[PDB]
Amino acid sequence: VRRGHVAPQNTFLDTIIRKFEGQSRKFIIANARVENCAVIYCNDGFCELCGYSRAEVMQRPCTCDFLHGPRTQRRAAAQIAQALLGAEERKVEIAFYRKDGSCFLCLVDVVPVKNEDGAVIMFILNFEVWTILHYSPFKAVWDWLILLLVIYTAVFTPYSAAFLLLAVVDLIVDIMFIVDILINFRTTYVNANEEVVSHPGRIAVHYFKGWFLIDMVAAIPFDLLIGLLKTARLLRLVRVARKLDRYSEYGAAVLFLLMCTFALIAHWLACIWYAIGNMEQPIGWLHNLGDQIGKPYGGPSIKDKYVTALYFTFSSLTSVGFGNVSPNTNSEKIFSICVMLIGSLMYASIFGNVSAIIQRLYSGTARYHTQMLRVREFIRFHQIPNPLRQRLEEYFQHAWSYTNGIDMNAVLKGFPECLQADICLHLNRSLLQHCKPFRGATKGCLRALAMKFKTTHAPPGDTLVHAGDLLTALYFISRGSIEILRGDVVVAILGKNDIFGEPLNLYARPGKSNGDVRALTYCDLHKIHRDDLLEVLDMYPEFSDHFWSSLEITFNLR
Amino acid sequence: VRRGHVAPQNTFLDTIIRKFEGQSRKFIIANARVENCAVIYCNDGFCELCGYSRAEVMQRPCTCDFLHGPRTQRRAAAQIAQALLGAEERKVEIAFYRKDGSCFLCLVDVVPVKNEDGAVIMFILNFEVWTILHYSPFKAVWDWLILLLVIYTAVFTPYSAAFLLLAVVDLIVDIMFIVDILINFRTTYVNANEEVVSHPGRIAVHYFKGWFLIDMVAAIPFDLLIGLLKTARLLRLVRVARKLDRYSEYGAAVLFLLMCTFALIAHWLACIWYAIGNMEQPIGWLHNLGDQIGKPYGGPSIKDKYVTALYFTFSSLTSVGFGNVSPNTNSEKIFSICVMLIGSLMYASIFGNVSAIIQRLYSGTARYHTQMLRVREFIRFHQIPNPLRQRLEEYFQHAWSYTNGIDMNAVLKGFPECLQADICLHLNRSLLQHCKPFRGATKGCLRALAMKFKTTHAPPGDTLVHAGDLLTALYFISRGSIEILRGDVVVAILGKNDIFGEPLNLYARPGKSNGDVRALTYCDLHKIHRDDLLEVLDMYPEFSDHFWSSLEITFNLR
Amino acid sequence: VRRGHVAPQNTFLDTIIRKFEGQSRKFIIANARVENCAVIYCNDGFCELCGYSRAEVMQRPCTCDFLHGPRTQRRAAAQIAQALLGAEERKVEIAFYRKDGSCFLCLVDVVPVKNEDGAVIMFILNFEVWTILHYSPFKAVWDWLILLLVIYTAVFTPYSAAFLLLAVVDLIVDIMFIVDILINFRTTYVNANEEVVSHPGRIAVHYFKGWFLIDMVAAIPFDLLIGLLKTARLLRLVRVARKLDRYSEYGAAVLFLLMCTFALIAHWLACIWYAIGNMEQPIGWLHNLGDQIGKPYGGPSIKDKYVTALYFTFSSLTSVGFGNVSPNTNSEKIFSICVMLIGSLMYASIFGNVSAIIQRLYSGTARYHTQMLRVREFIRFHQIPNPLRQRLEEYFQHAWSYTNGIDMNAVLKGFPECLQADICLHLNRSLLQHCKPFRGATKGCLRALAMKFKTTHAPPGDTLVHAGDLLTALYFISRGSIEILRGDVVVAILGKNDIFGEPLNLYARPGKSNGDVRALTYCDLHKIHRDDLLEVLDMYPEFSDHFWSSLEITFNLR
């Protein structure tokens, strides 16, 4: 389930703006911590009085010498500056001057807003002429536990009502639904704007207008014959329907929900089918059943009566139609017509989703077989030899098994720049945090680099760069051990936290290489471009003659 | 249903061009309102006579001194200029000169076209040697009302015809279809070119060649035995089939249309099934039914006879096959074969669309579950920690709940530039209309900006820009209240109609920032680029040294 | 099945680094073959002692004069250089100097690692104060052979168990599964990291923790009545389930696997259905069958008893429901309910995949009909005449029949640059290898060109370039014979290994042509751009004044 997170630390001032916005009592705000009380906020009512707009008045000291003039006193104006130091409510009899220079009647009111800690934070200067959380590991497994005993009520109450006319087992489940109402008050909820709402003096009104009327009638045991009024227990299904987004998170669990209801749909219809046999007695199906199983009228057994009924209604809605039991009278046919119509809707709709959910559960093997055919079609098209073939086969089977066919780059760019930067910062933390050049660097830079970086994985035996190739990139080894050869002669091996390529400075163009550079293990690494890195250090002259000095590339190449 | 909108105000002259185009009587046109009667239009017949092409003759005064020469008189030429002032038909005996300079026989005819108001508008100078609307709130709900009583005719007329051989209820529905024909004449229609056609002296011929012959025979009550000729009532189904595009607008209503016809398909076949029992009497199913329900031959009941028949034909076409009732004779089997064949087509086709329509109705929950799996797969791939995790989860669940998974930018660029500009002008009306710089601006500019603007939504607690980041953009706050911090020190809060960034002028490159800039409420806002805004003010030198003077950015940054 | 390929030739040193990394006994490595023993690898433990980082120490001779100073002897230091020549273990009592210049206690240990051949390769200098392959043509067809006799066990063991209470045929299949366990030890397997593992002293532990416990119990014949314990033979199905990725490669073979199991699902249920008739005897279906086939109780035949049972369970799970045989007692209905529920899941799930597999098998004709409609819709839209029509029809039907609707370029760019270059090098081998200019060229260039090349196929009668067109490209003829005309005058015909266009040098801009250039046969060829080729020769000044001299274009154009 989605969460509202939090209302930020300075939302208290946002609500104070709304009460004086409605009141229209002109005011301004200034923070105590920031040196000399800068003008952090001001409404349009104050700006119109003096004449100076927000562009001029914002980031001005709380003294405001622009407001003062010759008519204002030295003794009276000093009491404003000392009021904000001492923290106390003062009514200040003083005049002020506008932009043009006209004196007017005014009266200031300083009101310190003391926070939960103790110390004074803001200065609003007016002028006038037990609890529980809903995404908790207790509540998490509890919402499945309620669902398991909602299935009890839907299945055991029709069997009890229709057929009879487990002593201790009933009341333990019945009392549980009375406890549920108390739980919903104490547990939290998230409105779209209201990002969580603690303290029980708020949620009460949401539960009434939300779902009390329905869920309250569900949980009423009343013992005043005529016990058919226990059909109010079926309403408890509404506790699952409102919380439908909770259970769908587990995709494989939807098969259980769809297939169990398929039994209940048959179950109710089984119970109804039997009730039709009883309420009209003159020849139909029930007397006809007494000849099949040798028990005419005494009479046949109740457990047989339920089975045959559920057996019928399954045969009808599954669209098989056995005919060991089948309708005869007009009321029996009307039922069979109703079950055929709802069954034709059900059998198409409910197993149509099952066909999608089987593909959704095993979506890996779905697209993998289609993608595999494209490689084999590509091989048959161009006629690829076995040495080259196995590199295409291995890379595809590696890359798909690495990522599970997920578009890492495509899904990333759905999000905005700041969150994109945070994702790449999380991915490239191994390099950016644990290196001598990258530690000594500003936080604005590290985000900008992270965008331009590339997490390029390299499996065993690959060839990243070859002899006489133009080094457009610069690499950083996070995992494994990478060799460097030059005609079957091992030059050097480079483990973790290593660098290779050339310093983008020496001669200002992409220089050629010595030879190959292959991986031993799953030598997973990162990669940038010289075109990318140039655009960073231009935007940051401070972090540049510092980068190259501290950074030492462990392999120069020629 | 689609609409033709209107024929524009000056379409009267377009039709006048066609009559003289066919006649080939050379002519020109000039407007009275535009100062001195400029040449607004001219055919090729006039241009060939004089020699001067449209390039030269267009936007020339009505006097036309280029046409005149020495042979033309001062008294005669003056009567042309005074004719267009006075508004009256004059036959002007005068000569004219060509491009080369040769005199010829000519004769001018001025004909003022007086509009519906009164005053003269155009001058065509010839030379020679109760109603109703079909997208109205009355007609809207009425086309559903007709559909409800078309269902009556399809269902009650086979029951009346087949079985019998509600007095007041019949004739009230029968007379309604006679009224429908009168309604179709008075109500409007839209041809592809003919954008609506009012006044009843036009639609009459469309209704005859369209659908009168079919719908006229439908509405004939004739009382001359042999009342089987009331099967003409079934034609009234054609009133729904022609208007099929009307009902599909409501997607959830298609389920009702598909599932109700499924009953009617069974209904007709039920009525036909019974008719087969009657018209051949020697042993079949009808005598066989008299043993099941204890009424052999007296005879069984008519309401039982209908039920069992509808019960059979449902069992056959649903593909269940009960066999409490089943064919025996050759004619009964031929029916069962026909129902199995149409039923196998129906059960696949009609519920195949239902499977698509269930996905189309709940298409939100369809793609949401697939998109949600991509985020969880992305989290499992890179192994994202809970603090960063919840920002990806919240943003995805916010952004999807905001737009309902709609591609706002992709769908916009399907339309052309002028309509794209009109969409963005509608979206950004809050800023463009209600700001001191943007009010004082030409209308051509406001469209060009609107394209380059971006509606970037910002939920609570996000970080749009960070400390030491290059300010490529410039922002405008439409909703909410946005803070600015610099190391947990609140600098200022900015409400609606505010601006921040830097003035693209000071030092001609992207400057760095003070610190963070976070949202409190759903602080929805707009955004452009400095790269974008440069290209506007280059194309508009007038609106530039005016923009920067009047506009004052409420936060400069360093 | 996927393969691990190989562990590269110098993976022996990677494992030696791990043992001393855990031990933390500081060391360095140097190769014998590379001239004067360059420092190929060194851990951080050695670099911290001296002070010099990897950036400085890498590619330094094994002598290391930077380590030496005044305190070190001439006689002792000489024994280090002669030790690596002679190849023998020596404990060297010597001092060394750091970066700053401080003497300390040290002791060197040279250990030559002699490879499988004989000669010395590496020098690690420590300091201190019968088999079988699993992708073989034998094992390939063998894994289908095992699958064919796993079907025997699933089908013949229930018939033997349920009904009876082929002598030589049983034990030949039974003994085979004992041989399978010995095969799995000798045959190879690939772990994700462990790219194949030969020699039987490793796989043994994988087979135990993998699947011995399940497959061992399967292959136990034990003869101690009560022969129902042969149901352990059904476990042999696990040999197919673990190897499921093997059989799916053949897409058309999945139809056999899905449809054969459909028979087995019915088969088991047929055998179970009969067992229900026997184990409760007091009236049910079995006595009821004795009246249909005239054999009451003697009794009816066993082969009839199996058929009728399989006939029933097919009718139930296929969702037909015949009712020549049908349930009566409570236990029989419980079975029928179970078969209806699993059958409703099966009939939707198993034939849902069949619907996809029919489309997957004939996916060519699927997208071909959709793509064909787009061309006909495009022709109906713009109204294309027959001469132009047939060129669109022929090209589409040619191009689709050439590639089978495969995105050659889109699938290629899923792979990285080095493997992309290898694909294009394989495609363009006909030109790059068999030409006088391209033979005399470096291997780094040939990869860079291959990316920029384009395999543009040209069928009979096409027109590649026309008169007065700007020659942006340069062509190379691999197949067929290409004419050049200029107003129905045959200028020249060019066969294989020919060139035409102009030399990118003469006047530094795209020059115009003489006339047409058409194909006779399927004259398949390659193509580049002048924009592309300029960027190559700039990056390679060596291979440029060499390209143009040796290369002679067989047709200049003007």
Minimal Cα–Cα distance from B250 to chain C, Å?
29
d(CA C287, CA B326): 26
Contacts of A360 in chain B (CB under 8 A): 369-370, 373
Which of the other chains make 3 or more beta carbon contacts under 8 angstroms with chain A? Answer: B, C
Contacts of A456 in chain C (CB under 8 A): 416
Q: What is the span of the domain harbouring residue A75?
A: 11-127
Q: Which two tokens stand for residue B495?
A: 């409400």
d(CA B342, CA C127): 90
Nearest to C430 by CA among B539, A137, A382: A382
d(CA B76, CA B93): 8
Nearest 10 degrees: Cα torsion A343, A347, A350, A354: 160
Nearest to B303 among A330, A419, A422 (CB): A330
CB contact under 8 A, A40 and B512: no
State which approach was used to obtain the coordinates: cryo-EM
Which residues 6+ apart lie within 8 Å of B465 measured at CB? A418, B471, B513, B516, B517
Q: Which residue out of A259, A382, A548 would a mutagenesis test of the C interface target, given it has the greatest number of C Cβ atoms within 10 Å? A: A382
Closest residue in B to A345 (Cα) is B351
Return the beta strands (E) in B239-319 as ranges.
none
Contacts of C320 in chain B (CB under 8 A): 321
d(CA C52, CA A115): 56
Which residues 6+ apart lie within 8 Å of C189 measured at CB? C134, C196, C197, C203, C206
Contacts of B321 in chain C (CB under 8 A): 320-321
CB contact under 8 A, B322 and A343: no
Which residues on neighbouring strands pair with residue A306, listed in sequence order? none
Contacts of A192 in chain B (CB under 8 A): 401
Which residues 6+ apart lie within 8 Å of A96 measured at CB? A50, A67, A68, A69, A72, A103, A104, A106
d(CA B285, CA B287): 6
Q: Which two tokens stand for residue C75?
A: 């006689």
Contacts of A321 in chain B (CB under 8 A): 315, 320-323
**For every residue of C187-239, which 3-state class applies, written as one string?**
ECCCCCCCCCCCCCCCHHHHHHHHHCHHHHHHCCCCCCCCCHHHHHHHHHHHH
**Residues C289/C309, Cβ–Cβ less than 8 Å:** no
Nearest to C121 by CA among C15, C27, C30, C28: C30
Minimal Cα–Cα distance from C282 to chain B, Å?
30
Which residues 6+ apart lie within 8 Å of A225 measured at CB? none
Nearest to A444 among B308, B388, B469 (CB): B469
Minimal Cα–Cα distance from A485 to chain B, Å?
32
Contacts of B351 in chain C (CB under 8 A): none
Strand order in the sheet with B39-42: B39-42, B27-31, B120-127, B103-114, B90-97
Tokens 């007016």 belong to residue:
A126
Say which amino acid occupies B548.
W
- Cα dist from C548 to B429, C537, C552, C556, whole Å: 62, 11, 7, 14
Q: Which two tokens stand for residue C85?
A: 């020549």
CB contact under 8 A, A423 and B294: no
Tokens 């952090």 belong to residue:
A40
Nearest to B162 by CA among B285, B281, B9, B276: B276
3-class DSSP assignment, residue A118: coil
d(CA C448, CA B203): 70
Q: Which residue out of B264, B493, B551 would a mutagenesis test of the A interface target, given it has the greatest number of A Cβ atoms within 10 Å? A: B493
Task: Please count the residue pairs, one from chain B and one from chain C, whose beta carbons lie less than 8 angstroms apart.
Answer: 5
Nearest to A394 among C5, C58, C363 (CB): C5
CB contact under 8 A, A351 and C336: no
**Residues C40/C63, Cβ–Cβ less than 8 Å:** no
- Cα dist from C414 to B213, B228, B273, C2, C426, whole Å: 62, 70, 62, 19, 17
Contacts of C320 in chain A (CB under 8 A): 320
Contacts of A253 in chain B (CB under 8 A): none
Tokens 């060297």 belong to residue:
C92
d(CA A86, CA A91): 14
Contacts of C319 in chain B (CB under 8 A): 319
CB contact under 8 A, A493 and C8: no
Nearest to A551 by CA among A430, A437, A453, A440: A437
d(CA C354, CA B97): 85
CB contact under 8 A, C323 and B320: no
Q: Which residue out of A330, A412, A420, A537 would a mutagenesis test of the B interface target, given it has the greatest number of B Cβ atoms within 10 Å? A: A330
Q: What CATH number has the domain bearing residue A74?
A: 3.30.450.20
State the DSSP code for A518. Answer: B
Closest residue in B to A195 (Cα) is B460
Q: Which residue out of B320, B339, B349, B522 would a mutagenesis test of the A interface target, given it has the greatest number of A Cβ atoms within 10 Å? A: B320
* DSSP letter string, B172-211: HHHHHHHHHHHHHHHB----SSS----SSSSHHHHHHHHH
Minimal Cα–Cα distance from B339 to chain C, Å?
16
Nearest to A16 by CA among A121, A90, A96, A128: A121
3-class DSSP assignment, residue B490: strand
Closest residue in A to C316 (Cα) is A320
Q: Which two tokens stand for residue C259?
A: 């449809």
Nearest to B492 among A41, A195, A316 (CB): A41
Nearest to A140 by CA among A194, A207, A187: A187
C256 CA to centre of own chain: 24
**Residues A324/C326, Cβ–Cβ less than 8 Å:** yes
* DSSP letter string, A68-95: --SSS-HHHHHHHHHHHHHT--EEEEEE
CB contact under 8 A, A58 and B554: yes
3-class DSSP assignment, residue C265: helix
- Cα dist from A509 to A505, A545, C444, whole Å: 8, 19, 17
Query: Count of CB atoms within 10 A of residue B134's CB?
Result: 18
d(CA A283, CA A281): 9
Closest residue in C to A513 (Cα) is C444
Run of H or E residues at A492 = strand A490-494
Q: Which residue out of A27, A123, A289, A333 would a mutagenesis test of the B interface target, given it has the greatest number of B Cβ atoms within 10 Å? A: A333
Tokens 């940038």 belong to residue:
A528
CB contact under 8 A, A492 and C41: yes
d(CA C4, CA C241): 22
